From a paper:
Chondroitin sulfate A is a linear, sulfated carbohydrate linked to periodontal disease as the principal species of glycosaminoglycan appended on the surface of cortical bone of teeth and in supporting dental ligaments. Through genomic comparisons with B. thetaiotaomicron, a new PUL-like operon (Bfo2285-Bfo2295, and Bfo3043) was identified in T. forsythia and the crystal structure of two proteins from this PUL-like operon, Bfo2290 and Bfo2294, were reported using X-ray crystallography. Here we define a pathway for the degradation of CSA by T. forsythia based on the discovery of a PUL-like gene cluster found using bioinformatics analysis, functionally characterize three proteins (Bfo2285, Bfo2290, Bfo2291, and Bfo2294) from this PUL-like gene cluster and report the crystal structure of an exo-N-acetylgalactosamine (Bfo2290) and for a 2-keto-3-deoxy-6-phosphogluconate (KDPG) and 2-keto-4-hydroxyglutarate (KHP) to D-glyceraldehyde-3-phosphate aldolase (Bfo2294). As CSA is the primary GAG in alveolar bone, this likely serves as a mechanism by which T. Forsythia compromises periodontal tissues contributing to bone loss in periodontal disease in conjunction with host osteoclastic activity.
The structure was solved to a resolution of 2.85 Å in the space group of P212121 and iteratively built and refined to a corresponding Rwork of 0.230 and an Rfree of 0.276. The refined model contained 3 protein molecules in the asymmetric unit arrange as a trimer with C3 symmetry. The model contained an α/β topology shown using a topological diagram of the polypeptide fold with 13 β-strands (β1-β13), and 16 α-helices (α1-α16). Two distinct domains were observed with the larger one containing a 9-strand parallel β sheet (N-terminal domain) with the exception of β4 and β8 which were anti-parallel. The smaller second domain (C-terminal domain) contained a beta sheet consisting of 4 anti-parallel beta strands (β10-β13) and a long alpha helical region (α16) running orthogonal to the β strands but in the same plane as a solvent exposed structure. Topologically Bfo2290 was very similar to BT3349 from B. thetaiotaomicron. The superimposed structures had a final alignment root mean squared deviation (RMSD) of 1.105 Å, structural distance measure (SDM) of 11.021 with a cutoff of 10, and a Q-score of 0.797. When Bfo2290 and BT3349 were superimposed, it was found that many of the residues found in the binding pocket were positively charged residues or polar nitrogen containing residues with a positive dipole facing the substrate modeled in the BT3349 co-crystal structure. Although current experimental evidence supports an exolytic catalytic mechanism, or a high preference for ΔDi-4S, the only major structural difference noted between Bfo2290 and BT3349 (an endolytic sulfatase), is the absence of a bound calcium cation metal cofactor.
Numbering used by the authors: 31 to 151, 179 to 188, 197 to 424, 429 to 511
C-alpha cells in the first residue's frame, strides 16, 4: 500500500541537524549538535521516528549504497571499496536482489535520482536519473548547471506530480533520491546558494565548530560554513519535497525516510581527508522515518546499520514476508510498529575499513574492524602485509562523547571481554573476511 521516498544527501553527519539542540532530543545525540540551520528537518523530526544511533558500518559512499540496496555487508554486497576503474572487482553484484527488485516485483513503480555509480567502468527502477551530467531513462545526457540538489528535487517533484507521465499513478512508488551537493571543488564558495550561505557568513570558527574535538586552526576550518550552508540548502530542498507531498494527496500515505551515506568529521580530531574513520562524526548518520498512519513520533537508540535499511523498509511496507533470504540485515519494522515485544534487537554494529593491494587492483585487505555499542566504540587496525595488531581504539562514548580519551583496554579487562566477544559474534554472524581468514584469532 504505502509509497516510499528515501532521501539521502552525501557527507551529512547526524549531529548536523538543528533539532538536536532542543531538550526533547539533545540527550540522545553523542555530543553537541552542530549550529546548523535546518528548519524543515526540525519540523520533520517532531512528526517522525528519529534514530539517534544509526550507523554507516563502512563510512564510504559506494559501500553504503551497495549495503543500502542489497541489505548485505561490503564483503557480500560486492562493493567493499569505493567504486573505481582501478578496483574492477568492487561492483554491485548483478545477480543480487535489491530493495527496488523486491518492490518492483511487488507492484511498485521504482525511481532512482542522483549519484549511483555502483558499477565499475537498473534493478527494477522504471525511472532513472543518475548524476553537470545527468542521464534519462532513455540514456539521454542532460548538462544543467543548476545547483544539483535543486535540479534533483525538481525532477523528484515532477515525478511525484506525474508531470511527464513517467509513472503509473494507480501503483505505489519507491523513489530514491541521493542529493549530491558539489564539494568536488571545495575552496571557492561558488557551489552555494546565497539563500543558504547567508546564515553562516559573519560567523566565527568558534561559533561554527562547537564540538570539543574540533581543531579550529586548520585550513579546512574555513570550509565549515560552506559545509553547513549546503546542508541548509539540502534541508530547504527537502522542505520543498515535503510541501509537494502535501499539495498532492500523498503526505498521509507516504513513508518518508531521510538519511545519509556517511558523516563528515569536519576538523574533528584535526582530521584532514575526513572520511572512512570510526569516529562518531564519521559513522553516525541521520535517520528519520515519517509514516503518518503506522508510526508514532518518538526517538529510538537502535543501532541501525546500512544492511538493516532494506529489510526494515520492506517490513515497514507490509512486505516483510518477501525479504530475500541471504539478506543479512535486521528488520526493525516489528520493533518500530509495536511496543518493544522482541528480544534479538542488535546490541552492537560493525565498523568496516578495507583498502587495495595493487597490480589493476583485484583484491581488498580487511585492515580494520570494530563495533559500536550503545555505550562504547572499539576499532582495531592491523598491518596490511601481516595481519597483526597495529592500533586499538576504545572510547566510552557516554563519558567521552567527543572521543578524546582513548582508553587502554588492559586497564579494563572486564570490558575487554565483553567487547571482544561482541565483535567476534558480529564478525561471524555476517561471515566477515576477518573470519574467513581468521584474522586476529587472538
Amino acid at each position: 500500500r504505502p509509497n516510499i521516498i528515501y532521501i539521502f544527501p552525501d557527507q551529512m553527519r547526524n549531529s548536523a541537524m538543528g533539532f538536536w539542540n532542543d531538550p526533547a532530543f539533545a540527550s540522545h545525540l553523542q555530543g553537541k549538535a552542530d549550529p546548523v540551520e535546518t528548519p524543515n528537518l526540525n519540523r520533520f523530526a517532531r512528526e517522525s521516528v528519529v534514530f539517534s544511533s544509526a550507523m554507516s558500518n563502512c563510512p564510504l559512499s559506494s559501500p553504503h549504497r551497495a549495503s543500502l540496496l542489497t541489505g548485505m555487508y561490503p564483503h557480500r554486497s560486492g562493493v567493499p571499496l569505493n567504486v573505481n576503474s582501478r578496483r574492477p572487482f568492487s561492483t554491485l553484484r548483478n545477480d543480487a536482489t535489491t530493495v527496488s527488485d523486491v518492490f518492483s516485483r511487488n507492484g511498485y513503480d521504482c525511481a532512482y535520482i542522483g549519484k549511483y555509480h555502483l558499477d565499475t567502468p537498473r534493478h527494477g527502477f522504471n525511472f532513472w536519473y543518475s548524476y553537470p551530467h545527468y542521464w534519462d531513462t532513455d540514456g539521454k545526457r542532460h548538462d544543467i548547471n543548476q545547483w544539483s540538489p535543486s535540479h534533483e528535487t525538481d525532477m523528484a517533484i515532477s515525478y511525484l506530480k506525474n508531470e511527464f507521465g513517467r509513472r503509473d499513478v494507480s501503483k505505489p512508488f519507491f523513489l530514491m533520491i541521493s542529493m549530491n551537493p558539489p564539494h568536488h571543488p571545495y575552496n571557492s564558495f561558488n557551489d552555494c546558494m546565497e539563500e543558504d550561505y547567508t546564515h553562516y557568513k559573519d560567523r566565527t570558527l568558534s561559533e561554527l565548530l562547537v564540538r570539543h574535538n574540533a581543531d579550529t586552526t586548520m585550513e579546512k576550518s574555513s570550509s565549515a560554513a560552506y559545509y553547513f550552508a549546503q546542508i541548509t540548502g539540502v534541508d530547504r530542498e527537502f522542505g520543498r519535497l515535503l510541501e509537494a507531498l502535501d499539495e498532492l494527496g500523498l503526505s498521509k500515505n507516504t513513508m518518508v525516510v531521510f538519511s545519509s551515506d556517511h558523516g563528515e568529521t569536519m576538523c574533528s580530531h584535526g582530521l584532514q581527508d575526513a572520511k572512512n574513520s570510526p569516529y562518531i562524526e564519521s559513522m553516525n548518520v541521520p535517520f528519520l522515518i515519517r509514516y503518518p498512519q503506522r508510526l508514532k513520533p518518538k526517538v529510538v537508540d537502535y543501532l541501525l546499520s546500512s544492511p538493516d535499511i532494506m529489510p526494515t523498509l520492506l517490513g515497514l511496507s507490509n512486505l516483510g514476508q518477501h525479504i530475500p533470504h541471504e539478506v543479512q540485515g535486521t528488520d526493525f519494522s516489528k520493533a518500530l510498529f509495536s511496543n518493544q515485544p522482541d528480544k534479538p534487537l542488535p546490541d552492537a554494529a560493525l565498523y568496516i575499513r578495507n583498502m587495495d593491494g595493487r597490480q589493476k587492483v583485484r583484491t581488498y585487505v580487511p585492515v580494520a574492524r570494530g563495533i559500536k555499542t550503545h555505550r562504547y566504540t572499539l576499532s582495531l587496525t592491523v598491518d596490511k602485509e601481516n595481519k597483526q595488531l597495529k592500533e586499538i581504539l576504545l572510547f566510552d562514548d557516554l563519558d567521552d562523547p567527543y572521543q578524546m580519551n582513548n582508553i587502554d583496554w588492559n586497564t579494563r579487562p572486564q570490558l575487554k571481554r565483553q567487547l571482544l566477544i561482541q565483535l567476534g559474534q558480529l564478525l561471524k554472524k555476517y561471515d566477515d573476511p576477518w573470519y574467513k581468514d581468521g584474522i586476529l584469532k587472538d
